[PDB]
Design a protein around this ligand. Structure first.
Ligand code: ARG
Length: 243
């Protein structure tokens, strides 16, 4: 019958959740240096209901596929986007948030349209398919220099520096940042529309099915909607959407 991926997690009585521990709202360090956030609240309660211990393991984002496939982690959170390419590399659970990639500039520069990004340098977080998102904007293919950086803070530093003229960020983890830092301008047109998921090893169907069953319970009983209201100010959960 089932593949042993759930059994393995139940026997260890633990789920190792790989995260980037600097993603605002979703998985970041609070003043006490504890990892907190929307994704953390979800997996902490999910593992509680499953009778297993959640282990939030800080990873290097660029290594996430290797760490997962070699078993260092069991799944990947921190705002993991569904892409068509990634469907060939990961088993992804039913999406839980919508997201969009947006382009941010310095506000005092008059950037209004994506077309004004031509012949510019744009910074993206490495291994986030942000380069692919930009290369899919007609105005920008073959007319942009893309700089890949290791953290989100580095993007804003380059934007403050003049090392780049714009950056790509995800709307979801930017909702507080750009509500409050209006030294920055968002180009009206987003460059992608996406879903966030939690990524698992391809073969691990029984583990993902177990996880999805509990996520559904936690969404219907308003636990996750209320986590969303806590972190975002409204209920953004889309776990009752059927894909
Ligand atoms: N290092 C992070 N987790 N950054 C947050 C954005 C991640 C991006 N949506 C991705 O799937 O690659």
């Amino acid at each position: 019958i089932e593949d042993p991926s759930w059994s393995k997690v139940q026997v260890k009585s633990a789920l190792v959740i790989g995260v980037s521990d600097f993603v605002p709202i979703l998985s970041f360090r609070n003043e006490k240096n504890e990892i907190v956030g929307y994704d953390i609240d979800i997996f902490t309660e999910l593992c509680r209901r499953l009778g297993i211990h959640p282990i939030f393991y800080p990873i290097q984002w660029a290594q996430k596929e290797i760490l997962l496939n070699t078993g260092v982690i069991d799944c990947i959170a921190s705002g993991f986007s569904v892409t068509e390419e990634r469907k060939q590399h990961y088993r992804m659970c039913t999406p839980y948030l919508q997201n969009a990639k947006i382009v941010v500039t310095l506000a005092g520069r008059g950037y209004q349209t994506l077309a004004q990004l031509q012949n510019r340098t744009i910074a993206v977080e490495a291994d986030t398919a942000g380069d692919e998102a930009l290369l899919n904007v007609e105005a920008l293919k073959d007319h942009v220099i893309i700089k890949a950086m290791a953290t989100i803070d580095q993007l804003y530093e380059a934007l403050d520096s003049g090392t780049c003229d714009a950056i790509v960020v995800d709307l979801i983890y930017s909702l507080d940042t750009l509500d409050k830092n209006p030294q920055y301008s968002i180009i009206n047109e987003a460059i992608s529309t996406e879903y966030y998921t939690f990524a698992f090893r391809q073969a691990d169907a029984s583990l993902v099915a177990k996880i999805e069953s509990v996520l559904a319970e936690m969404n219907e009983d308003e636990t996750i909607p209320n986590f969303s209201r806590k972190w975002f100010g409204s209920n953004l959960s889309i776990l009752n959407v059927r894909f």
